[PDB]
From a paper:
In the present study, we evaluate the activity of nine anti-[name]-[name]-2 monoclonal antibodies (mAbs), previously isolated from convalescent donors infected with the Wuhan-Hu-1 strain, against the [name]-[name]-2 variants of concern (VOC) Alpha, Beta, Gamma, Delta and Omicron. To understand the basis of neutralization and escape at the atomic level, we used cryo electron microscopy (cryoEM) and X-ray crystallography to determine structures of the two mAbs: TAU-2303 and TAU-2212. To summarize, our study provides functional and atomic-level structural data on the interactions between naturally elicited antibodies and [name]-[name]-2 variants. Both TAU-2303 and TAU-2212 are potently neutralizing but arise through different B cell developmental programs.
We also crystallized Fab2303 in complex with [name]-[name]-2 [name] and analyzed the structure at a resolution of 2.42 Å. The results from both the crystal and cryoEM structures indicated that Fab2303-[name] complex has a large buried surface of 1185 Å2, with the majority of the contact surface (64%) derived from the heavy chain of Fab2303, and only 36% from the light chain. A total of 29 [name] residues in the crystal structure have direct close contacts with Fab2303. Consistent with the contact surface analysis, 19 of these residues are from the heavy chain (HC), while 10 are from the light chain (LC) of TAU-2303. In accordance with the biochemistry and in vitro cell assays, 14 (K417, T453, L455, A475, F486, N487, Y489, Q493, G496, Q498, T500, N501, G502, and Y505) of the 29 contacts between Fab2303 and [name], are also involved in binding the ACE2 receptor, thus confirming that TAU-2303 neutralizes the virus by blocking receptor binding. The angle of approach through which Fab2303 binds [name] is 25° relative to that of ACE2. Position 417 is particularly critical for TAU-2303 recognition, as Fab2303-HC-Y52OH forms hydrogen bonds both with the main chain atom N and the side chain atom NH of [name]-K417. The N501 side chain forms two hydrogen bonds with main chain and side chain atoms of Fab2303-LC-S30. The mutations T487K and L452R of RBDDelta are located outside the binding epitope of Fab2303, which, thus explains how TAU-2303 can still bind with high affinity and neutralize the Delta VOC. Significantly, the Omicron variant, has mutations in seven residues within the binding epitope of Fab2303, including four key contacting residues K417, Q493, Q498, and Y505, providing the structural explanation to the lack of neutralization of Omicron by TAU-2303.
Residue numbers in the entry:
A (entry chain H): 1 to 133, 137 to 219
B (entry chain L): 1 to 215
C (entry chain A): 334 to 527
């Protein structure tokens, strides 16, 4: 009954606009302090904006003059209009009912905003070949230069799951993502067992099967 | 501007332990403090407001204390669902650091040294004109690990990126991959590519290396 | 017959801002420059009037409003401002004619463990009109379900205690405020300079 539901996030170029919505139930937005809080990937919470019952509005200096907080009293909905977006505005955005000295007690599930100049591109997949030298070898696949998130990786079409580590993606200075997926296998199997990584990249309709062999 | 600093950034404990996380305000803020819990991919959840008042619904094993500049959140007996990141919030004030940077509560286990592997760039990548060198640290604990790239025994800074897995659901270890990126022309200017790994489970730093052009 | 400005500025207790105090200053001689030349005040801002020339002016009446607020809230006691104080506790009009005087009162208005006498209105559905004073204690209805005067979810007491505590930072410390309003009407002038 008491919940906050958000929507409107998506991919946008720098200088573009986005309007986030936050539909409330269980309380009245017109009668409450409401604030927006955002969380850039891998970082902490940053307070963004706030609106009073009486109508006063406030903004963190990082968004001052670019964002506008508003509401629709009939729709019991809170908004955030986001103009002149920049790369550093990339975050999960949350709306929350602000009870001031009682904290922020009702939060939404969050909506994801990405601001980038990068062209959508499927990844190159390169092998991380097992070393020529406990009988446990390590091999993997380097999934390089894709945009946007996400990429899923499997090994031998799902038949190999034990000991797989698919690392979180890292954002390169070029604006494209890169991640690695590794697995440790018995050294005795390098000659006999086939090891194929299945890289899937759905925003570019890319399905790539790369075979990882011991190098000559 | 009043700032909140949370310490430690990462804290390890086990089920049943008494855990205490600290948050400091750069100036006195009376009891205008709130505590939040956040799990990966989920919204923050309010735990305590007014420094010490428990939020309706929160289990009594959570308690907050302090007034002025030092505030503490205590968990009397840790439960498996309590492993999360905990955030500090100053109240009736919205400065640039309204929320503290957060403290991640993680699962304690015995020490485990990393298995280190180094991977040269594939021949296929070099044809594209770029060389990525990958160093892997597998199944180690604690989180604390230093990876030092060396190129012809010269310490390399500014051209590597790291990422770390979540704590494994079975053995509670971490894994780390460090990627050194060079252009083809620069890569072919040097011979010895080495990855030096420092970690509590190793009595001395462990180095994996390869000589370019040799298998 | 000097104006009783000493009763106001040196009053031993002060009012809560939600129930701000007002004394009518009339039929007296006002030496303003004893206030202006003083190094006592951290804020002395006048509007629609020059502070230098105050002893050369007559007015129909002068109102002296006094209360206590946080240090970083003193900025809201000015024309065109917003915030918890300006919107919900004490609002000045855009055409304000008068002076705002404030000073740090941490040594007087804070106690170890917290002074809880000074209150402010935290919850209100709409903003105050200028010079309005709301002293209501009705449980604030933050949702559709009526409160029936009972505290609970979406049912909050509208006033909150500052809880001043001497280890507070300056922005959180208590400040005493005196607001002098000057009105010039088509009527005899009761307050003149010396
Ligand atoms: C308040 O008292 C101080 C000290 O006794 C005095 O200097 C000051 O003039 C007084 N203020 C007023 C407005 O009378």
């Amino acid at each position: 009954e008491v919940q906050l539901v958000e929507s409107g996030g998506g991919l946008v170029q720098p200088g573009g606009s986005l309007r986030l919505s936050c539909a409330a139930s269980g309380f009245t937005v017109r009668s409450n302090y409401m604030s927006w809080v955002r969380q850039a990937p891998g970082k902490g919470l940053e307070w963004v904006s706030l609106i009073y019952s009486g109508g006063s509005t406030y903004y963190a200096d990082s968004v001052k003059g670019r964002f506008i907080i508003s509401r629709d009293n009939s729709k019991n909905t809170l908004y955030l209009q986001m103009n002149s977006l920049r790369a550093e505005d990339t975050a999960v955005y949350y709306c929350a009912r602000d009870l001031a000295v009682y904290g922020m007690d009702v939060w939404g599930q969050g909506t994801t905003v990405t601001v980038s100049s990068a062209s959508t591109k499927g990844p190159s997949v390169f092998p991380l070949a097992p070393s020529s030298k406990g009988g446990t070898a390590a091999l993997g696949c380097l999934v390089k230069d894709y945009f946007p998130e996400p990429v899923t990786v499997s090994w031998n079409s799902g038949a190999l799951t034990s000991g797989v580590h698919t690392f979180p993606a890292v954002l390169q200075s070029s604006g494209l993502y890169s991640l690695s997926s590794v697995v440790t296998v018995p050294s005795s199997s390098l000659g006999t067992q086939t090891y194929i990584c299945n890289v899937n990249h759905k925003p570019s309709n890319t399905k790539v099967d790369k075979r990882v062999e011991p190098k000559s | 501007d009043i700032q909140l600093t949370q310490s430690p950034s990462f804290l390890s404990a086990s089920v049943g332990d008494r855990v205490t996380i600290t948050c400091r305000a750069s100036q006195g803020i009376s009891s205008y403090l709130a505590w939040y819990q956040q799990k990966p991919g989920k919204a923050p959840k309010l735990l305590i407001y007014g420094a010490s008042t428990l939020q309706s619904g929160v289990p009594s094993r959570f308690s907050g204390s302090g007034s002025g500049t030092e505030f503490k959140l205590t968990i009397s007996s840790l439960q498996p669902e309590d492993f999360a990141t905990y955030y500090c919030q100053q109240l009736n004030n919205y400065p640039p650091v309204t929320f503290g940077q957060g403290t991640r509560l993680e699962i304690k286990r015995t020490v485990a040294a990393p298995s280190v592997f180094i991977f040269p760039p594939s021949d296929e990548q070099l044809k594209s004109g770029t060389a990525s060198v990958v160093c892997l640290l597998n199944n180690f604990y604690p989180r604390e690990a230093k990876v030092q790239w060396k190129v012809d025994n010269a310490l390399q800074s500014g051209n590597s990126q790291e990422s770390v897995t979540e704590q494994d659901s079975k053995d509670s270890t971490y894994s780390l991959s460090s990627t050194l990126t060079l252009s083809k022309a620069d890569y072919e200017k040097h011979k010895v590519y080495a990855c030096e790994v420092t970690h509590q489970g190793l009595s001395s730093p462990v180095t994996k290396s390869f000589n370019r052009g040799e298998c | 017959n000097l104006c009783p400005f000493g009763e106001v500025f040196n009053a031993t207790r002060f009012a809560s801002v939600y129930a701000w105090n007002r004394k009518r200053i009339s039929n007296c001689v006002a030496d303003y420059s004893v206030l202006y030349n003083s190094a006592s005040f951290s804020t002395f801002k006048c509007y629609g009037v020059s502070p230098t020339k105050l002893n050369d002016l007559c007015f129909t009446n002068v109102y002296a409003d006094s209360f206590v607020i946080r240090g970083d809230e003193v900025r809201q006691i000015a024309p065109g401002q917003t915030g918890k104080i300006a919107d919900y506790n004490y609002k000045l009009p855009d055409d304000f004619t008068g002076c705002v005087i404030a000073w740090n009162s941490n040594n007087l208005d804070s106690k170890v463990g917290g002074n809880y006498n000074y209150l402010y209105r935290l919850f209100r559905k709409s903003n105050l009109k200028p010079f309005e004073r709301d002293i209501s204690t009705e449980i604030y209805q933050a949702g559709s379900t009526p409160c029936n005067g009972v505290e609970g979810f979406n049912c909050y007491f509208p006033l909150q205690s500052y809880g001043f505590q001497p280890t507070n930072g300056v922005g959180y410390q208590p400040y005493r405020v005196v607001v002098l309003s000057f009105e010039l009407l088509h009527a005899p002038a009761t307050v003149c300079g010396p």
